[PDB]
Amino acid sequence: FPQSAPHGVVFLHVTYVPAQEKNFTTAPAICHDGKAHFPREGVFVSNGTHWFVTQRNFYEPQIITTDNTFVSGNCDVVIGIVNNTVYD
Amino acid sequence: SVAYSNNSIAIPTNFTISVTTEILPVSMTKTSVDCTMYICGDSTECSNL
Amino acid sequence: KFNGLTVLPPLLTDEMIAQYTSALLAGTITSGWTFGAGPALQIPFPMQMAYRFNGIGVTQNVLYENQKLIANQFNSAIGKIQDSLSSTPSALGKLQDVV
Amino acid sequence: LLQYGSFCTQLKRALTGIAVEQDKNTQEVFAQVKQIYKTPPIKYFGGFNF
Ligand SMILES: *[C@@H]1O[C@H](CO)[C@@H](O[C@@H]2O[C@H](CO)[C@@H](O)[C@H](O)[C@H]2NC(C)=O)[C@H](O)[C@H]1NC(C)=O
Ligand SMILES: *[C@@H]1O[C@H](CO)[C@@H](O[C@@H]2O[C@H](CO)[C@@H](O)[C@H](O)[C@H]2NC(C)=O)[C@H](O)[C@H]1NC(C)=O
Ligand SMILES: *[C@@H]1O[C@H](CO)[C@@H](O)[C@H](O)[C@H]1NC(C)=O
Ligand SMILES: *[C@@H]1O[C@H](CO)[C@@H](O)[C@H](O)[C@H]1NC(C)=O
Ligand SMILES: *[C@@H]1O[C@H](CO)[C@@H](O)[C@H](O)[C@H]1NC(C)=O
Ligand SMILES: *[C@@H]1O[C@H](CO)[C@@H](O)[C@H](O)[C@H]1NC(C)=O
Numbered sequence: 001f002p003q004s005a006p007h008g009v010v011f012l013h014v015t016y017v018p019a020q021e022k023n024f025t026t027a028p029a030i031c032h033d034g035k036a037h038f039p040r041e042g043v044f045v046s047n048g049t050h051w052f053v054t055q056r057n058f059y060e061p062q063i064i065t066t067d068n069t070f071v072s073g074n075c076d077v078v079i080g081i082v083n084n085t086v087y088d
Numbered sequence: 089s090v091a092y093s094n095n096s097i098a099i100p101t102n103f104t105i106s107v108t109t110e111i112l113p114v115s116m117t118k119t120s121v122d123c124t125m126y127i128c129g130d131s132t133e134c135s136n137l
Numbered sequence: 138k139f140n141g142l143t144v145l146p147p148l149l150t151d152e153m154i155a156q157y158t159s160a161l162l163a164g165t166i167t168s169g170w171t172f173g174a175g176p177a178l179q180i181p182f183p184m185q186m187a188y189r190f191n192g193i194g195v196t197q198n199v200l201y202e203n204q205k206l207i208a209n210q211f212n213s214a215i216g217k218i219q220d221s222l223s224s225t226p227s228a229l230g231k232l233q234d235v236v
Numbered sequence: 237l238l239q240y241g242s243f244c245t246q247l248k249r250a251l252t253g254i255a256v257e258q259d260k261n262t263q264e265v266f267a268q269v270k271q272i273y274k275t276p277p278i279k280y281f282g283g284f285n286f
Binding site for chain 1: 174175176178179181183184187196197198201202204
């Protein structure tokens with residue numbers, strides 16, 4: 001938002017700042033039936049026993065499903081792959 | 089120091105809205121100066137020289 | 138010491154500037170771009186590189202299946218820089234013109 | 237020289253302004269962050285030298 005001042009101008013900027021972060025455990029890919037799975041838009045996050053997918057700038061876990069992932073590859077190339085179940 | 093690890097990540101769970109200002113000059117004063125009045129004034133000899 | 142001509146020292150010494158540069162490097166290596174907009178958030182380096190590849194229109198599986206090749210290319214590219222700088226005698230003309 | 241005026245004050249002001257601006261340039265360019273971060277003791281980043 002702009003404001004007028006003598007011999008000058010003043011701007012009022014509105015921004016977005018994250019807060020209250022939490023540490024998690026993550027994996028680059030998920031293996032299932034000998035196929036690799038990568039997230040469409042998000043990152044795999046584990047809370048200790050289960051695995052979810054969430055957006056990067058806000059914590060909102062979801063159930064891993066074939067609608068937010070793509071296979072695109074095999075299970076013997078990626079380093080650090082973790083194998084779990086993908087619901088249909 | 090942030091505890092870097094190769095299987096760990098951090099994700100925010102809340103947000104904040106902030107407002108900040110910024111000041112920028114745009115223009116300055118306009119002036120005009122007359123030669124003879126400043127240097128000589130009302131002397132004909134000074135103007136001729 | 139000349140005739141009325143003196144030279145003043147800068148407020149910030151070279152060590153302080155080096156510390157600033159080191160802090161910037163550590164932040165950008167261990168956090169990505171998150172420390173430039175708020176609290177610094179940790180992330181593994183290959184995942185940050187996958188994000189950056191995704192930011193130019195290339196999918197993540199391209200990075201995740203070519204990690205070693207890209208790492209070797211980056212290592213060679215960073216290695217050649219010192220030789221390129223040393224061999225060229227007029228690489229730093231801009232910083233010499235001021236003096 | 238006292239009869240000439242006040243040129244020396246102008247010269248001093250100009251030079252002092254130049255020096256202050258020179259300090260401000262570096263202060264603005266380099267002091268971007270407020271925290272001094274550190275690298276982990278173990279320098280492994282998935283196969284990348286730094
Ligand atoms: C996110 O942050 C906001 C701002 O602090 C939290 O809202 C506050 O919650 C406390 C606890 O009940 C209240 O006492 C304050 O009055 C709230 N502030 C406002 C402006 O409403 C919010 O609870 C946080 N979100 C979560 C999930 O904890
Ligand atoms: C990063 O590159 C440097 C430079 O090539 C590597 O350090 C070299 O290691 C070999 C084997 O020990 C030595 O013979 C060289 O003298 C080293 N170079 C220098 C400049 O000292 C280093 O090993 C690489 N990083 C990793 C993790 O291997
Ligand atoms: C998560 O755990 C690590 C390891 O102890 C710690 O360094 C980090 O501060 C934790 N993150 C949060 C947000 O508490
Ligand atoms: C992790 O998420 C699962 C999914 O419901 C839940 O059952 C479990 O209690 C969670 N673990 C913790 C420590 O919150
Ligand atoms: C699933 O992952 C575990 C852990 O590495 C591995 O031992 C196991 O062989 C994997 N499953 C299959 C079917 O290979
Ligand atoms: C990186 O991952 C490997 C897995 O083989 C692990 O041994 C190592 O401790 C990790 N690095 C750090 C700094 O923990």
